[PDB]
Amino acid sequence: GLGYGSWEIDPKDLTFLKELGTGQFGVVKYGKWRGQYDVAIKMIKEGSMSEDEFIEEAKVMMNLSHEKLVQLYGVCTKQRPIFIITEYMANGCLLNYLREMRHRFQTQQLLEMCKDVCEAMEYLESKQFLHRDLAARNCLVNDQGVVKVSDFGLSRYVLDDEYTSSVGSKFPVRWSPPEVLMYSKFSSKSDIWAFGVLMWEIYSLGKMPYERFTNSETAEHIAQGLRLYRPHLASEKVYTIMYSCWHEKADERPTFKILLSNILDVMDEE
Ligand SMILES: Cc1ccncc1-c1cccc2c(N)c(C(N)=O)nnc12
């Protein structure tokens, strides 16, 4: 349409249906686009996001597509209550899904969730794109039980300093390697560390990492070289994979390509 770039979606094409949940940019709703196509509508909360910066980045994000990566559809910009329009994921956030004991997951299903995420992450890594806040809260589950990685890179646009200061009350300390906590050194290997913690979350059925510790205590534990330990549902081989993400030296941590190989190996063996 006349006043629209390819990254831009006319909000008048949206039908709102129900609330899906919430998080750091506020509410996310389920809708239809042009009456027919399922979408999630992230209704970005006023003053929560560096919106011009994000909008520019969205243009780059439009070109990221992978089956295990939540698809960005476009953005509604002509309105500073902006909308981000994404792939609809009917089963919601992975963290809540893991915590519902009714599912009675087999460990084979849990390993597949790890592989889903790993595939998305290998893709992002092949594009030199850091997630920057990988965790179960940032993974979604579709109506087929497939896990996909969401909100990739969005922490760069969070205006709330509680989220972005490493000592900030809202920083993801529990998903952070020592070099992030100590000197804010983000890299592919910080994404690797978080993926390991994500595997732990999955095999722990959504327990909080370091659940008995405060953030400050967690940071001290980690800096001393101590680690999460083996969830009851992880085999020795699965435990080995997650633990490899937590090498004190960042350059000794695997890539997502190697981790994917390792996960496929275990799948063939177990
Ligand atoms: C993952 C996330 C990050 C930031 N703020 C909200 C969410 C979120 C919470 C619950 C449910 C959903 C959901 N169903 C969809 C979706 N695309 O369907 N997206 N985000 C959700």
Curated annotation (Swiss-Prot):
Outcome (variant: R137Q): In XLA; severe; disturbs ATP-binding
Active site residues of this protein: D133 (proton acceptor)
Placement of sequence motif CAV1-binding: 193-200
Modifications after synthesis and translation: Following B-cell receptor (BCR) engagement, translocates to the plasma membrane where it gets phosphorylated at Tyr-163 by LYN and SYK.
Impact after mutating G225D: In XLA; mild; interferes with substrate binding and/or domain interactions
Places the protein is found: Cytoplasm; Cell membrane; Nucleus; Membrane raft
Residues binding ATP, per UniProt: L20, G21, T22, G23, Q24, F25, G26, V27, V28, K42
Outcome of swapping C93S: Found in patients with chronic lymphocytic leukemia; uncertain significance; results in resistance to ibrutinib therapy; results in a protein that is reversibly inhibited by ibrutinib; disrupts the covalent binding between the enzyme and ibrutinib and
Binding residues for clofedanol: T86, E87, Y88, M89, L154
Tissue localization of expression: Predominantly expressed in B-lymphocytes.
Mutagenesis or variant effect for D133H: In XLA; severe
Modified residues (Phosphoserine): S216, S235
Residue positions where Phosphotyrosine is found in the record: Y163, Y229
UniProt-reported outcome of changing E201G: In XLA; moderate; interferes with substrate binding
Residues annotated as domain Protein kinase: 14-267
Binding-site residues, dasatinib: T86, E87, Y88, M89
Subunit structure: Part of a complex composed of EEIG1, TNFRSF11A/RANK, PLCG2, GAB2, TEC and BTK; complex formation increases in the presence of TNFSF11/RANKL. Binds GTF2I through the PH domain. Interacts with SH3BP5 via the SH3 domain. Interacts with IBTK via its PH domain. Interacts with ARID3A, CAV1, FASLG, PIN1, TLR8 and TLR9. Interacts with MPL/TPOR.
Involvement in disease: X-linked agammaglobulinemia: Humoral immunodeficiency disease which results in developmental defects in the maturation pathway of B-cells. Affected boys have normal levels of pre-B-cells in their bone marrow but virtually no circulating mature B-lymphocytes. This results in a lack of immunoglobulins of all classes and leads to recurrent bacterial infections like otitis, conjunctivitis, dermatitis, sinusitis in the first few years of life, or even some patients present overwhelming sepsis or meningitis, resulting in death in a few hours.
Domain notes: The PH domain mediates the binding to inositol polyphosphate and phosphoinositides, leading to its targeting to the plasma membrane. It is extended in the BTK kinase family by a region designated the TH (Tec homology) domain, which consists of about 80 residues preceding the SH3 domain.
Function: Non-receptor tyrosine kinase indispensable for B lymphocyte development, differentiation and signaling. Binding of antigen to the B-cell antigen receptor (BCR) triggers signaling that ultimately leads to B-cell activation. After BCR engagement and activation at the plasma membrane, phosphorylates PLCG2 at several sites, igniting the downstream signaling pathway through calcium mobilization, followed by activation of the protein kinase C (PKC) family members. PLCG2 phosphorylation is performed in close cooperation with the adapter protein B-cell linker protein BLNK.
Family to which the UniProt record says this protein belongs: Belongs to the protein kinase superfamily. Tyr protein kinase family. TEC subfamily.
Protein name: Tyrosine-protein kinase BTK
Organism: Homo sapiens (Human)
